[PDB]
Symmetry: D3
Subunit: 156 residues, 6 copies
């Protein structure tokens, strides 16, 4: 109720974290109706989320659901916390299902200052992300920061 | 306010987790009046909760307090999260004080599909649970899924 | 809204934990306006909070901000949890900026029963705390339980 | 030098753990020549070993390498530790590459007393294991405890 | 072979850690014959070792086995590591079975400088230790640093 | 005895890890004489090692001691493990005391393929490292991969 999609959408977005990176395979999901986090499922695979994973509050993608976001970070961020992030790209898949890739803003961590587009990350990292969402499904590929921004805007 | 005791009480119950299994000996407790989790105590024993431990929202047992539930799981579930569970038994103790034993529903984890009654678990596991609540108190023993269901119904 | 500064201010205080001791360098902060925890920043230093760190709800120090409290404990307490604590001292710094040092009440953990004043802790511990806040800034030093209590009262 | 393949091969086997279950994606490997554990690699996938993983000392499979073993357990076992286990099955793959599935002996943990063959585990668990080794490669399937025992004997 | 019982027995002792404090219930044990750590057992109780637990190398108590030592510490110490400690007391039990209680030397951590005898710890802590060894057995009680030293000397 | 300083010194070095990154403040140190890891000390500061920290076996710097190395990695590496790394720079300090900065080789993790010199890391990261060694002492600054290589060669 008191939290929006960002300070400066689409350049900066607020992301509510649902699942911490490098956590056990527990898929938490915020339940709008209950106003609480629920265990959606234990993953049937010995896999973990490769980045902090959550959503942009008050967005509505095609499915009616909020825009999902991967936030790369140096340390896991707890479920329930808001992090100020900036998109750098989007992973596009058919099951169409997109996942924004974002990094913390310079205010939050300067480590990622040099990541301006998804391709500024190591390809091994990008490939690990697309593998996760495939095998945990057809992966169309990565698209650039502008496409991600446009997707965020259309969901507002 | 927006969360009930279950989808399909008593066959399925919502459980709000207070304490994660295999966590440090911190006894958290949801405080209705504060509407927040509080540290009830640090356990005076080098013991930890043998399963995720919490309560069924909007139940009222004899003591006036909600029904307490142990949820066995493959990984710890965070305090505050709702998990959909199904009872399989009840641990009955005198201090009378009962603890429902439940497993995640098939939707949440299929690992426990074959646990239909408490006696389907290894006896070593069941014994570990009764030891915990004794020594962390007189343990009457285990009773079956039907008794657990009846207890849940009487608390609605 | 439903939680106050303490049962028995200033002898006992409620503290809402923001950051767990011995956690990753993630500075969480409760955001009054959003009514949610936010990532203030990832610490630019390979440092961690030396005690559970949080605030006394409904206090207003000079800066307008709630009184901050370090709660020493045997195990980390999760962000969001309320712990009943008792002040034993205050760390006074110029950037003036004070941090209450408190321990869990006897109800919560009897380990700290013998800590009645900050000087009852090992000096190595006290020094570790002042080093943290300096280097993560001029440290004026420690002041006693009475001063801490008076500071808490002036913030009510 | 001072550790053998088991007390009672093939019914009981000693397994030297290399990688703990539910650990970070670090593939450790014992290096015979160095007589030390080495980081073989960081896994290119956001995957973790689904069970404790290691080898039977002084075995020699077809590849010349020791027999590899997954040991299911209630808690991770540290790299370097010997655990007394008993095979219950084998996962057979083509890249031929087999992985023994074993459980702790009754002496070590009675939880698994009722697992006498791999099929006594939940199918979801078995499927998680075969998925891991595929996607972290052609999986032929599971074979029974007798086949696993025969494989262990041929490697002595 | 290259490690002794202490620099300055019995005032200072070397302790080889077998089990870390606040670890999962895995009882590791150094096996002299194998020259490796082995899983003795998974504890049948949801209990954990209340302090780092290990032995003094090249001691021989009545049972023929090395002297066992609990080392209190601020953080867990890994299995396999040597820590320089100083005894402060002994927990005496009948099953006779004694456990030395020791703290890190001032060189290793100054936190414990003020612990010169077991009774300098909070009674809640001491009681937690005796409860653990009872319920994980008849506890005779605590004896002072001099008795502990004499026990260490008789085992040399 | 059976492990050397590297495959291809100085372009590639073997590093024996002593302390894991993001671990508790326990300074472990390999003791040549005991042939075991020892607790050197608990750090007097609420600080942790910013990278995996260890040494190159069979090197001898000016002090007579092996060359120390920070190995940046995506996940902590356990104490005792050998990792194949490549130097990218050196942190030079006066107390002269140098710390090699290295990354895993492409074989071990491709994430760091693009780090060829220390300056390819974010400055915030480099600054965090120099702060750690100062405050856990005069920091002269960073020098390039060639200087690091020359230092490694002079220690052979």
């Amino acid at each position: 109720d008191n939290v929006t999609g960002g300070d400066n959408v689409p350049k900066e977005i607020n992301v509510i974290i649902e699942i911490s990176q490098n956590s056990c395979p527990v898929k938490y999901e915020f339940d709008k109706e209950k106003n609480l986090f629920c265990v959606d499922r234990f993953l049937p695979t010995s896999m973990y989320y490769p980045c902090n994973y959550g959503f942009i509050p008050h967005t509505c993608a095609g499915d009616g659901d909020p825009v999902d976001v991967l936030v790369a970070s140096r340390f896991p961020v707890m479920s329930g916390a808001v992090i100020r992030a900036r998109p750098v790209g989007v992973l596009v898949m058919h099951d169409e299902d997109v996942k924004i890739l974002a990094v913390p803003t310079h205010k939050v961590d300067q480590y990622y200052n040099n990541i301006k587009d998804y391709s500024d990350f190591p390809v091994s990292f990008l490939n690990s992300i697309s593998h996760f969402f495939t095998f945990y499904v057809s992966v169309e590929g990565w698209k650039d920061v502008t496409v991600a921004e446009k997707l965020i805007l259309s969901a507002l």
